[model samples]
Target: NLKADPEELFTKLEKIGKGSFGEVFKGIDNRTQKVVAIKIIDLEEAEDEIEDIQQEITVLSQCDSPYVTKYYGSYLKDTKLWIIMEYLGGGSALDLLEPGPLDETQIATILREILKGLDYLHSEKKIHRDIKAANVLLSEHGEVKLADFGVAGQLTDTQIKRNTFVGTPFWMAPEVIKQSAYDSKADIWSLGITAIELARGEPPHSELHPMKVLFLIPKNNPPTLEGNYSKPLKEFVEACLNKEPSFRPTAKELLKHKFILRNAKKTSYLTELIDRYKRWKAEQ
Candidate 1:
């Protein structure tokens, strides 16, 4: 039901957001009478890794949860790839992170749904190698959806990811930094770094050089759980960041962690964050 030939996908208009990689623009799908977002990326820039783009299309087509951004399809034209996706009118997680960090009660609401998204990704053996605050876009209703898969890898139970030194510098796991074979546990490590980013109002390694992070993460300098965090929050970050990839909880395993399971109905924190961003975005 999601298929659409790139040639005929009518683009209504485009509004750009501050982000890395290639630019994304808002478009309209003629078939559905709805607005969509189209991310234009160059095929040559990837060293001919068209496989990554194909893998992205393959992984996204399988996703159907409201917790994650739905993928439509991709195609090659004029030496570029066009990724047609949902248009999130609400904006991104970095915009929300600018003002400040969310308190204990707030992070509880944010991570619960995020874990659900991760659960769905892992079930398909698709790992979102970049799971930081910036990549999670927020909807108008204040729902957070995992939005990027530039470096996502498709893995199997016996198959492990190798040969790609990818992911944001701050979110890199020990295994990923070391360039070793790893499973979806790598995503768990990256997600742990995201928790710290959400709590600290900026990425934990923001001040460090890329080379410095490369040196530190592999040597096991994991971000510390801050002093004021509740035990549930503290444990959840710790479990996801288990230094040994094998000891890390799978995304599905993490869904059962007390922090998420215990606070199912809570959403006050996400609402507070969204309100703060609305005010900040307005004043600027």
Candidate 2:
């Protein structure tokens, strides 16, 4: 509780996930016995990424929300930086889809939950930059939370915007692909793509190469909601996929749309969705 060593603080258990930035493990705090997800970023190229890693921490440290992952603390070990965070056992939105694309009821719940996170970030002059199934995480009890800040950015209080060509291809907004200045509205576009992912198991044009998708995003019309989805849901995605950012609805506005309002359910409703994912994994 007073002062602790990183290595001595937690006992790392199993490797839960890993990627370009770092590896995440299920861990247990020795003192409190609380479960946590520990991120170990090897400091091999510290000089090249110290600032970037610190920036990620800074971006995360500013937040205090139920819809966002909770960062407990960070410590620098001998050759790695360890980030401690609250554990979310249900995995990501992408993880849940392993069973299959979500039904309209489940997808609507996810959209509403993520919109709340986006609304919070936008109000703080922050742009998550990355908004996709892979970045949306959930707890064992079905509480949705936004995770990953590897490419997130902050806007100046005076004027908030960006022009960096970052984020995954399948979910990147047209303005981001075009390398033009963009605002929080860019995330709205990605949310649209995410909705399609949950509904159909993948974003449109996903079969194309990432590089090709970049060109198609700006050159082609925004992907349309297809099949027999509800009219309100179609309209919600339509507003998010607006080619012009100015025409897209803000997260706050979308939260009020009938698509979100009428179909919204308590977090507990997602318990069945999580169960479905678990059953699917077991069968696999």
Candidate 3:
């Protein structure tokens, strides 16, 4: 069961983030002297999607992997729900992307961490369904973890597949766009799209009309890494973007690829990247 602490347990600070419907605050835990992120969701604002919030909580409760975001507890006050989570001071990958796309080395480091998270989720029979730069968060030390589970799905049987049309159009997989039965492989495909965004500051056909991109994803050739990028990186992207879900390598398999093994850096290495982003922000 989810813990229900009093609202007085924590002091809310400035808003650190906002989502499709809720706002997140930087909070101070009164007793533990720990800083946490508290997501305040207004039930009135989500009258139609109450189940969505509950679903996220349920999925988060079942996750114990270090690669995934940690959920501390939740509280209901008035018409708002306060959900507590581990604070990641480094912000999100999307936050850093504003300065510029990450170089291959940085992208490699991010992917390796996220792949570990995906492997763990798959092992637990949960499909993130949404794998993009926006959903990847980093700690102050640059330890990466996957977040945002409002659209995640759980597989009841090993052989079962989902047929839901969900996820952002830009990072969504072909099978998901086609409304066909898909599984964990859909997330692998989105990871490939996100890799493109990290490398090029955008995904393939990003400039194309959204409706056209949707049509092309399932009908056109799978997205590939272009330019003079490393061959291993290109292969890694191609391996993940395979149009056929069965043809795409699993997150566990991709974690062992040379691209991940040779290029992945220590989490602390990302501290420099984040610092660089902060420097650029200050300059602007």
Candidate 4:
């Protein structure tokens, strides 16, 4: 059962990454012999309690989409909590950026997949409050999936809006930064910033202090995609970054945008980026 000791069910390997919650490791599931990503949260060190951890697990476990990472199970190991997830060998979009900013075709392909993931989450009344390159993972086969649910929010029929002040500053929506009652539309704003990050290698105002960014995002006009880019691509970014949450297009609507429809390349095309990242990592 999932409650069994993790040590007996999985062989923990090298540490892969670290997040707000804990350190992630590459592991092997003993029973299925399948590769997995194990997130080990030090319960003692975490500011959040088991109740908060379980909330994240509940959100993760309910997700059922190819565009979202798959959660296997969770186990308690003494003072630590082990969360099992599907291992994606291609790493994150942030990792892919080590080689350099992505081209328009690659950006469109990645954004298309993210929109699909957002569509699923929003339909389920879940909000992936954080949507950035770092949270978008890719499989070795070039499939893209959204990851990290540290601050994801679930909305009930009666409680439609959230006032929680969470998420990274540069990618945060104006409503979110203002701590106003916001909904899934907050994620659409982040998606726009992510597109800029994929193309420019960083979100706008990334050079500024995060606190300063929080101030600017709400006061300044929404940032736009600058430099040489196609009209449709620019329009797509604009649609997502609308200052008014009500004006922002839903993920479902964005999917039909000309930029996504015309520029999105096949998933296989992203394998080149994975190979590029691997080669770069080897040099380091």
Model 2 TM-score relative to the real fold: 0.95
Best by lDDT, which number? 4
Q: Taking the tens digit of each residue's C-alpha lDDT, what string does model 3 give over 1-284?
A: 75565467888889977866899899888889788899998889787789878888999989999999998887888788889888888878887788876878899999999999999999998999988888999998899999989899988866589998889888899999999989999999999998888888877888778888788889888989999799999999999999899999999999999999999888889997788778888999
lDDT-best of 2 and 4: 4
Residue-level lDDT of model 1, residues 236-275, one tens digit each, is 8888877898898877777787887775455534666778
Residue-wise C-alpha lDDT for candidate 2, range 39-59, written one tens digit per residue:
998978557677778878888
**All candidates' TM-scores?**
0.87, 0.95, 0.95, 0.96
Candidate 4 lDDT over 210-262, as tens digits, reads 99898888889889999998898888889999989999999999999999999
Per TM-score, the best of the predicted structures is 4
Off by over 4 Å in 1: 1-7, 18-21, 42-51, 75-80, 161-163, 264-272
Count backbone overlaps in model 4: 0
In model 1, the clashing pairs are 106-269
lDDT score, candidate 1: 0.76
lDDT of each: 0.76, 0.88, 0.88, 0.92
State candidate 3's TM-score: 0.95
Which residue pairs clash within candidate 4?
Answer: none
lDDT (0-100) at residue 201 of candidate 1?
70
